[PDB]
Ligand binder design. Structure first.
Ligand SMILES: Nc1nc2c(c(=O)[nH]1)N[C@H]1C(S)=C(S)[C@@H](COP(=O)(O)O)O[C@H]1N2
Ligand code: MOO
Ligand code: MOO
Ligand code: MOO
Ligand code: MOO
Length: 444
């Protein structure tokens, strides 16, 4: 009867622990959200023993997206960070770059001075400790995220690069950032003709012209990859996207998998998917499986007895739904140095227009014709610390901050123990469709 908020985002995470898919409408099913063929945690990566592989084991799973376009599923994993990792490589000790300048990490220039002392002083200043010329991969990734951020900041303040950048699609934007990271903003701003052809979408002409530059001559193999990316607008020069059919042949094997200790089947999605995931993670042999509706689902009441005996899920942790408010997220953000997005907490329904943590008090919600019933709070873990853009798991922000102020009340410590509360689990009371913009009504 009374409105307590509005749906602001809906997210489906088709493969467990991988990138969310934002949607404007979704059907609410007893097992979670569905948008056509994409259903929430209906796909799972497993190892050779059949055990789940989650972002706890492989934080780079958050980089992988499974999306659907009509007919075909696409698996894709590339973004600017991964593109530059491939092009810049990784060195944990000070080395000289190809122009003789001291550098470290992922292409991080320390100084143009010939003094190794100046390079070490710059390294200790940048990392904040006495490194003795050596860093950890985590520290290289920290410098790298700062360096990419600085390159995009630079493009957006540059009058010659900004209009090109803004005209480019998301993949070709990454090729322009890649150039700026390598050669700096002034250098890239100098390619007057190639920049013109890019802004005009004359991709073959721009590819031909950029291959005549001095850049190409100095690093032709890297230039050829950035060029292909501008020519095609695809990731064919890097981890190329894999296109699979929506329907998996029923001749493919059904595996007995284990998710959070409980058994569940999944139909193997085929060798191309397995090789693609394994290659990208550089891991032991993994497979991708998909839950089909005739398989026995997992039972949340076996995981937490507050759930009803009839509740069912495929591969999610515990619940068919997680709901979070924008208010709760803006709150945590007013306490954090590095800001986080709803994506860190993996909610399916994000609700705006309410007071902080209002969702903890919402026992029964009507959204459209969908009714949802609150079961319990979502208690948080290290998965919240995996950065969704870089795939790097941090040292516990934002978990530590959550820990400081969002613990469960002693009167309640048997479900949650100590693990901070951020988001609420819900189940379905009536099926239907929900849309971004739907008012949310608190019932009873
Ligand atoms: N639908 C749903 N969303 C959820 C949960 C859940 O059990 N069900 N658990 C949450 C927790 S605590 C975590 S760590 C992440 C795990 O996401 P994954 O299952 O895709 O790895 O989903 C979050 N959102
Ligand atoms: O092989 Mo290195 O230069 O320690 O990363
Ligand atoms: O003007 Mo260039 O430097 O032919 O792109
Ligand atoms: O951005 Mo384009 O001209 O459709 O390939
Ligand atoms: O960075 Mo390369 O392999 O010289 O083109």
């Amino acid at each position: 009867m009374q409105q307590v908020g509005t749906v602001a985002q809906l997210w489906i995470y088709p493969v467990k622990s991988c990138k969310g898919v934002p949607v404007s409408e979704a059907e609410c099913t007893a097992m979670g959200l569905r948008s056509g063929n994409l259903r929430d945690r209906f796909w799972l990566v497993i190892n050779q023993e059949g055990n789940m592989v989650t972002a706890r084991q492989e934080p780079r799973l958050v980089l992988i997206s499974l999306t659907c376009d009509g007919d075909t599923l696409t698996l894709s994993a590339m973004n600017i960070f991964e593109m530059l990792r491939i092009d810049e490589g990784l060195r944990l000790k000070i080395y000289k770059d190809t122009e003789g300048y001291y550098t470290i990490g992922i292409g991080h220039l320390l100084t143009k001075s010939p003094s190794l002392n100046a390079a070490k002083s710059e390294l200790d200043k940048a990392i904040g400790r006495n490194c003795n010329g050596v860093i950890t991969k985590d520290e290289a990734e920290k410098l790298f995220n700062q360096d990419v951020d600085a390159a995009v900041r630079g493009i957006l303040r540059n009058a010659k690069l900004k209009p090109v950048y803004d005209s480019l699609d998301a993949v070709r934007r990454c090729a322009l950032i890649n150039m700026v990271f390598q050669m700096g903003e002034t250098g890239v701003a100098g390619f007057t003709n190639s920049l013109r052809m890019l802004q005009q979408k004359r991709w073959d002409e721009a590819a031909v012209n950029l291959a005549k530059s001095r850049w190409y001559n100095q690093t032709p193999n890297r230039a050829k990859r950035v060029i292909t990316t501008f020519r095609t607008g695809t990731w064919d020069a890097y981890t190329k996207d894999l296109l699979l059919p929506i329907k998996t042949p029923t001749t493919n094997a059904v595996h007995k998998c284990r998710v959070h200790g409980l058994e569940i089947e999944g139909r193997d999605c085929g060798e191309a998917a397995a090789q693609w995931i394994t290659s990208f993670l550089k891991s032991q042999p993994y497979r991708l499986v998909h839950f089909e509706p005739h398989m026995r689902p997992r039972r949340p009441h076996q995981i937490a007895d507050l759930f009803r005996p009839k509740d069912q899920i495929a591969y999610s942790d515990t619940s068919p739904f997680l709901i979070l408010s924008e208010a709760s997220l803006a709150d945590l953000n007013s306490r954090l140095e590095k800001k986080v997005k709803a994506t860190n907490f993996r909610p399916n329904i994000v609700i705006s227009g309410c007071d902080v943590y209002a969702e903890d008090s919402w026992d029964e919600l009507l959204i459209g014709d969908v009714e949802l019933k609150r079961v319990m709070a979502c208690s948080r873990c290290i998965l919240t610390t995996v950065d969704p853009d870089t795939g790097v798991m941090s040292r516990k922000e934002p978990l530590e901050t959550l820990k400081s102020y969002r613990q469960c009340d002693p009167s309640e410590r048997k479900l949650y123990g100590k693990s901070p509360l951020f988001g609420q689990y819900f189940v379905l009371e009536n099926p239907g469709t929900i849309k971004v913009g739907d008012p949310v009504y608190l019932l009873g």
